[PDB]
Each structure stands twice: as C-alpha cells, then as structure tokens.
Amino acid sequence: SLARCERLRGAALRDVLGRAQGVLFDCDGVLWNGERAVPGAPELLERLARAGKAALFVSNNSRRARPELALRFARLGFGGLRAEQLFSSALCAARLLRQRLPGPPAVFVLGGEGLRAELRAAGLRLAGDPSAGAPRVRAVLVGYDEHFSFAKLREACAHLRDPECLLVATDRDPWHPLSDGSRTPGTGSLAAAVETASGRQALVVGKPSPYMFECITENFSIDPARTLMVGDRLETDILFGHRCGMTTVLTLTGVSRLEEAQAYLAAGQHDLVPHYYVESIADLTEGL
Amino acid sequence: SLARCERLRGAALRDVLGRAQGVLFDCDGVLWNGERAVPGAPELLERLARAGKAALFVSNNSRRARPELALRFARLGFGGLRAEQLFSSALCAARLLRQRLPGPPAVFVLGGEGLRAELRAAGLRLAGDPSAGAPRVRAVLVGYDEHFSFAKLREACAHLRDPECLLVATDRDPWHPLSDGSRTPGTGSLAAAVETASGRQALVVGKPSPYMFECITENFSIDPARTLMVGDRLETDILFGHRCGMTTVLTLTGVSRLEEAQAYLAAGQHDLVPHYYVESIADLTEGL
Ligand SMILES: Cc1ncc(COP(=O)(O)O)c(C=O)c1O
Ligand SMILES: Cc1ncc(COP(=O)(O)O)c(C=O)c1O
Ligand SMILES: [Ca+2]
Ligand SMILES: [Ca+2]
Question: Phi first, then psi: what are they for A7, rounded to 5°?
C-alpha cells in the first residue's frame, strides 16, 4: 500500500495537486470547526476553481437538507458554489431509500426536520405523515435524532421484526466535538442501540461506506485515480478514500491526530493510514 | 471441555442431582415467562428444599429492588424463600458501586425507581437527589431505562469526559421477549449507545460477568464444582456457568433454542455450550 503518511509539501505538493483533476472535501474539521472557517480555506477553494480543478463536498451531517447546507457554505465564506457540489448523508440516504425500498409500486425516521425534508423532497413517504382518511413501514432510517427516546427505539424494533423491513443508518460517527470542548453523541451511538435491540445490522449510507461515492458518481464523472480525498477523520474519511481508490490527505484541524495515524501505520492497518497530511488545508494552496 | 449438550435424564440425572450440593437458577424463561409460572417449577423447588439442596436465584433484571422481587416469586407460586436467596443486577450493581466508587470519604443513573431504591438502600448518593442548601458525579450507571433519551445520553457522556468517572452497566441483555410475541429493548442496547458516544467500555455487573458470582459468594459458601447453573440464555447464563466453573443446564422454555446450542458445539465455541439440557425444569424433579 502506498499510504505512508508523508507531510505533503514542496515539489511533491505541486506534483500531487498538478495531476489531480479534482478534490473531494469532507466538511467539519476541514473547511471549518463550528462557526469558524479554517483560515485560508475559502482562498484555497477560490484558487482550486481558478486552477480548473473540480471541488466536491461530502459530509456525514444528516441535519440540514441541501438548501440549508448551501447557505452554511456561503455564510462561512465559501462563495460561488453550486448546490449540486454538496453531498450529505441525508441526501444520499434519501436516494438510497428511493432505490431500495421494497414492495409493489413508508419509512420510519429517527431524525430531525432537515432529514425529513430531504426525504420528502426525494418523494419518500414517512410514517407519521398524515393518512388517507395506515401505510406499511418498509424501512427504519436512523439519523441524528436529538429527540431519540426509549419509546422510539422500541417502535423501531417493532418495525424491524419484519425481516423485509430495511434498516438504514445515515452514518456511524460516534460523536462530534463542539466549540466549548464538549462532545455531542453521534448517529453511530443511536445506530448501535437500534442494532443491539433489534439484532439487525444496519446498511450505512455515509462515509466510510462506498455508497456515498456511488451517490456522488451518478452526476459527476470523477476519476478516483485522479481525485484527492481530504478529511479530518481516520476511520471515516481516510478509510473512505482508500475504499474508493482515492489519494487521501489528512488535515489536522479536526478529530484525528497525526500520532494516531502513525500508530496505525506502525500496526500495518493501511486503510486507516492517509497517503499525506497537512497541518491545515491552507497549506495546499501554495501547490497550485 | 466437558460441555457436550447431552439431554439430562435417567440415571445420569439422578447422579448429577445427587452429587450437586446446590442449584443456581436464572429466573425469566426458567421459572416463568411473564405472568405464567413454568408448570412444575414450584414443585421442583419445594422438592429441592426437601432434598436438602441449596437454591439461589440470579436475575439480570434491574427493575425491581429486592423487596418487590421477593413478592414476584411468592406470587408466581415459589413459597418459603428467603430474600437473601435472590440476586439481581440491581442489587449487585449497588454493591459493586459501594466497593469501587473513587474519591475520599454521586452516581448518575439511567434507570427506573426500583433500581434507584436499591442504590439508596446500599447507601449510595444519586445525582438528581436534592443538594445541601452540587456533588461531583463519580459513576454513570446504565440500567433498564424506559425514559432513556438523547438528553440523558448526552448528559452521561458529559460525566464520562472525566476518565476517573466510572462507567457501569447492570447487564448487556439486548432485548427480552414479551407475552404477545413482541420484544422490548434491553439494557444492552442502552449500554451500547452510551459506550459508542463516550468511547468508553462499561464494567458489566450481571451475567455473564464473574462479578455476579463474586457477589453471590460473599454470603454463601457455594462450591462451583458442586453447583448447577440453570438458565435459558446461551450467551448469558451458560457462558456465566462456564466462567464460574459450574455445571450448566440449559432449559428450553426461554430465549435460546437447542439448535443454537448444537451449532455452537459444532463450531467448537465450548463456553457457549451447556453441559446438559432439559425441555423444562419440571424434568429435573424426577432425579431427586
Ligand atoms: C450530526 C452530525 N453528523 C456528522 C457531522 C460531521 O460530518 P462531517 O465531518 O463528515 O462533515 C456533524 C458535525 O458537526 C454532525 O453534527
Ligand atoms: C429489564 C430486564 N432485564 C433482564 C431481564 C431478564 O433477566 P433474567 O432472565 O436474567 O432473569 C428481564 C426479563 O424480563 C428484563 O425485563
Ligand atoms: Ca469531518
Ligand atoms: Ca433468563
């Protein structure tokens, strides 16, 4: 495996960025942390566009439907983006369900309103939507649900008794660091509860699952051999890149540490090793 | 390993029961299923007592403090028992916490009122008990919590940031079958959520953890070489027996199936294989 966790700089950086036809960016810990843009991140993106390089964005965040996601970008300084460049676990979960729901021509959702709006915009019928003056549930979708409860968990497991009812999770991120240094439970903790209580394994929509890449490649010809994958999370973004055959760059502004990446290297766990790293994605700009 | 999953009957049954000085019974799926006693179970216990054999009871149920547990037994036909014969994950979690709480001379609890009463009766201070006109949390205890919520999960994880704060679970049972054929999420699903979101591994109080046996042996001299362990759950009661060096008997009135036990045998997973099985514990009576 080519993954040696080398600091990317100099002529190698110019070489790597030169040959790349495109860049896939993970979002949180990469472009920004909370309400603060990573300094130099907007400029990197302006300069990518100008250098004729394709930029796409992949987030496991299931809380915003695409229109609200588009607004977060521009607001944090990332101007002139098309909404078609933005891929989240919410959008892709909606598409996956449209593609795989069984039965002849409803989804029980653990998640918020952004997630639900996204699902409705894809044409899906949700349990808890009004009746026709009581539709069979054919998928349980686990997303980020701040109103997760034991009753909703028991309800999910009830639907799951039917072995033809699908189980899908938006993502398995276990938690996410917040501004003040605290963490919030991720969808991966809710997924774990649903899986344990039901005895089922969930289908994962988001990184590090190939499906996300499948979802991105339906609208864009992107050559994985010529695309960089940039993220802050070893078990999510880096594993994802390796699985899609992309060159992976870990940035150190987010969840994972350089020492963790090196430890994985030492242990020969190569799919969890980035090909390159940078302190922040501001460092990629000089290679253009 | 001596675990061959043999049907226990005849002269072997008389031999096995003859040499045994005592019997440890798991409760649900063994003595009863819901509100219905297993026919012949009360008689088995009357006859054990009369044959001078010690009977003890081990349940992972964390919902009843001991006095309410004692009442469930008698009511379902199991008369003349001492409360000292009854061990649950609630009682033992209380003892474990009294023994291991750090700091110089409070517990955040996910669980119901039975569990809390048990903890208070052991002298423990609970978060959410009134202040002294705001005590440091030194353990998070995960029990069966029908009011589990995302907010309580985030709260648990907050306490768990402190690496000296303990994480304890009553048990990992994933779910439990109900009367009407439905299942209810178990503590194991809530534990899984807390562990995933915190990144911590919990200390498990109940079967199949040795601690339960440790807890039972503090008041009783029981020779594990001469004690039968009887239960309905391979990964809980049978594994538990093997770990405590007891002779294990699987009864088929509960969660696990004979075919699952045989499959484990076939795969050489010996700690998940009962030494013996019976259709119901009523079949043990004739060996006395
Ligand atoms: C609910 C949720 N999911 C996922 C993420 C992170 O997604 P990503 O880092 O892939 O952009 C966040 C980060 O805040 C989040 O809040
Ligand atoms: C919450 C809970 N825990 C555990 C159990 C079962 O415990 P055991 O089979 O060890 O007696 C039950 C069974 O109903 C239960 O409801
Ligand atoms: Ca990220
Ligand atoms: Ca049982």
Answer: -60, 120
Asked if residue A218 and residue A77 are part of one domain, the reply reads yes
Closest-CA distance, B235 to chain A, in angstroms, reads 14
Question: Residue B5 region, left (φ>0) first, then alpha (ψ -120 to 50), else beta?
Answer: left
Is B189 within 8 Å of A149 when comparing Cβ atoms? no
Q: Are residues B242 and B182 in the same domain?
A: no
In this structure, the dihedral spanned by the alpha carbons of residues A72, A75, A76 and A77, taken in order and rounded to 10 degrees, is 130
- Domain of residue A218 covers 1-88+207-288
The string of DSSP letters for A208-248 reads: TSHHHHHHHTTT----GGGEEEEES-IIIIIHHHHHHT-EE
Q: In chain B, how many domains are there?
A: 2
Contacts of the segment B96-100: beta carbons below 8 A, 24+ positions apart: B96/B168, B96/B203, B96/B205, B96/B211, B96/B215, B97/B122, B97/B124, B97/B139, B97/B141, B97/B166, B97/B168, B98/B122, B98/B123, B98/B124, B100/B139, B100/B166
Residue B60 Cα, ligand 4 centroid: separation in angstroms?
8
Q: Does A257 touch chain B (CB under 8 A)?
A: no
Helix (H, G, I), strand (E, B) or coil at B47: helix
Q: What is the CATH number of the domain that holds B61?
A: 3.40.50.1000
Among B144, B150, B180, B235, the strongest candidate for a mutation testing the A interface, having the largest count of A CBs within 10 A, is B150
- Are A214 and A239 contacting, i.e. CB atoms less than 8 angstroms apart? no
- Residue B188 Cα to ligand 2 midpoint, Å, equals 11
d(CA B53, CA B163): 45
Mark whether B76 and B216 lie in a shared domain: yes
Is the domain of A196 the same as that of A117? yes
Place of tokens 């686990």: A142
Residues B108 and B30 in one domain: no
Q: Of B189, B206, B223, which residue constitutes the final position of a domain?
A: B206
Sheet-wide strand order for B107-110 = B107-110, B139-142, B166-169, B203-204
Q: Are residues B62 and B101 in the same domain?
A: no
Instruction: Spell A88-114 as b/e; 16+ CB within 10 A means b.
Output: bbbbbbbbbbeeeeeeeebbbbbbbeb
Chain A residues touching B144 at Cβ < 8 A? none
Residue A259 burial (10 A CB sphere; 0-12, 13-18, 19+): exposed
N residues, chain B: 288
B98 and B188 co-located in one domain: yes
B190 touches chain A (CB under 8 A): yes
Report the structure determination method. Answer: X-ray
Last residue of a domain, one of B206, B234, B268: B206
For residues B174 and B235, membership in a common domain is answered with no
